[PDB]
Amino acid sequence: KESAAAKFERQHMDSGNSPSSSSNYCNLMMCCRKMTQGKCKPVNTFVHESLADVKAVCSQKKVTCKNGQTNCYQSKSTMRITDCRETGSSKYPNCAYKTTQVEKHIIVACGGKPSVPVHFDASV
């Protein structure tokens, strides 16, 4: 069972950082969205457009998937996204990321019925 001391540090300590940072986004979001458990996911992109806009990409430009599958689609317009990339300093479990705000076209794999995004392939 997590110690009371450890619980206090988890719930109440942020030594660490300040809320006024813009660059801590990936650190917190990768943790929030459970991509730092077991190991640090090295690269992950968050999309800030609406879910409807991202789902719409599945009806947009058919493109080659980086993994050679044939179910990828490129957005017709650039989207506001954030790339989270694990730093060289980063060491599990202290997963550290650089946050890069970008506006690029996204490529996603679509699947299911209705066809919706199931994998983020790349940005271009």
Ligand X SMILES: O=c1ccn([C@@H]2O[C@H](CO)[C@@H](OP(=O)(O)O)[C@@H]2O)c(=O)[nH]1
The side-by-side arrangement of strands in the sheet containing 106-111 is: 61-63, 72-74, 106-111, 116-123
- Pick from a copy of itself, ligand X, none: which does 91 bind, CB < 5 to 8 A by kind? none
C-alpha 96/C-alpha 4 separation (Å) is 25
The residues that are catalytic are: 12, 119
Token pair, residue 37, equals: 């458990």
The structure tokens listed for 17 are 């950082």
44 touching ligand X, by CB under 6 A: yes
**Among ligand X, a copy of itself, none, partner that 124 touches (CB below 5 to 8 angstroms by kind):** none
Using rule CB under 6 A, residue 25 touches ligand X: no
| 45 assigned to a ligand binding site | yes
Which candidate, 40, 38, 49, 113, places its Cα nearest to that of 81? Answer: 49
Residues that bind a copy of itself (CB under 8 A): 3-5, 7-23, 25-26, 28-29, 31-35, 44-51, 54, 80, 82, 99, 101, 108, 111-112, 116-120
